[PDB]
Amino acid sequence: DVQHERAYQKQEGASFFNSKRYWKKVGLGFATPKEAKEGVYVDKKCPFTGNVSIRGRILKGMVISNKMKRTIIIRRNYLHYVKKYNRFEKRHKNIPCHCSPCFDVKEGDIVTVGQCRPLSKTVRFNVLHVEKHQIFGSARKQFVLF
């Protein structure tokens, strides 16, 4: 496909003198998507074809913003227990996640992210699975079991 960036697309570990792409098992009952296996895409922060380690905790959240370059913001929604009244209250937390060129995620999709290697200042997690989902209420106001 077309090029448009100022960097050569290495896709490290590809190899070029052995007879005729790179991707890995990813594990934990998970597997590469069809667009990972057959796609032309190049990245280094992609979990499938990058060197980023799919280590640590794996959680589900809801995508609230999808408009950064290959990067998503997921809200993790929860009920916080209040001991004093012996009652619960609604609470939530935002997790910045890499999105992959594999996944064309949309608002209110559930996403299964992993802890992985910290990428930068804010961004530290990465999507491993996109579970497609529809909610017509505005994302900032939405509560789900994720």
């Binding site: 100022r6 050569y8 200042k121 804010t122």
Partner: protein, 171 residues
């Protein structure tokens, strides 16, 4: 310098205590140039020694087509895919595009075929152009400021074409 004092995840101004510790750095850039070799040894934590190249000249350059590498003089620094500063000043880093003399490679090809190990699909026309003028574009593959060297590979095929076009005519 390193660590804490940058803005909060909220955008807030975080108040700082816990004074700067030894394990928190901020240390000088490499500025290796083109000229008769000079490197200074740097002492890192644990007495781990690093090499800060200040001048360089002959690196180890790898011929992709046969997968072999030889130590070779660099003729010039010619292009940088980032800033205009590095290339104008002729200061070289692992991004940089330099030019090497083709005689080790030319000799090796003569040794293998008898005119200019084992059979492949052999020399490419872009590689042939570079060899023909005796002066060959190459990409540095090592970090001079850390390793003391700017060893590299001759820049090949699609990467060569893309950068050759990007480098140019307008210039």
């Amino acid at each position: 310098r390193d660590g804490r004092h940058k803005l909060r995840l909220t955008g807030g101004k975080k108040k700082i205590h816990k004074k700067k510790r030894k394990y928190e750095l901020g240390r000088p850039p490499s500025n290796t140039k083109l000229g008769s070799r000079q490197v200074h040894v740097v002492r890192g934590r644990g007495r781990n020694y690093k090499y800060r190249a200040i001048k360089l000249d002959s690196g180890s350059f790898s011929w992709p087509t046969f997968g072999i590498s030889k130590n070779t003089r660099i003729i010039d620094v010619v292009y940088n895919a980032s800033n205009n500063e590095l290339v104008r000043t002729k200061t070289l880093v692992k991004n940089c595009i330099v030019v090497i003399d083709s005689h080790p490679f030319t000799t090796w090809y003569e040794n293998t075929f008898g005119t200019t190990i084992g059979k492949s699909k052999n020399i490419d026309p872009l590689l042939l152009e570079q060899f023909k003028q005796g002066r060959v574009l190459a990409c540095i593959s090592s970090r001079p400021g850390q390793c003391g060297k700017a060893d590299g590979y001759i820049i090949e095929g699609d990467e060569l074409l893309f950068y050759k076009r990007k480098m140019d005519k307008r210039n």
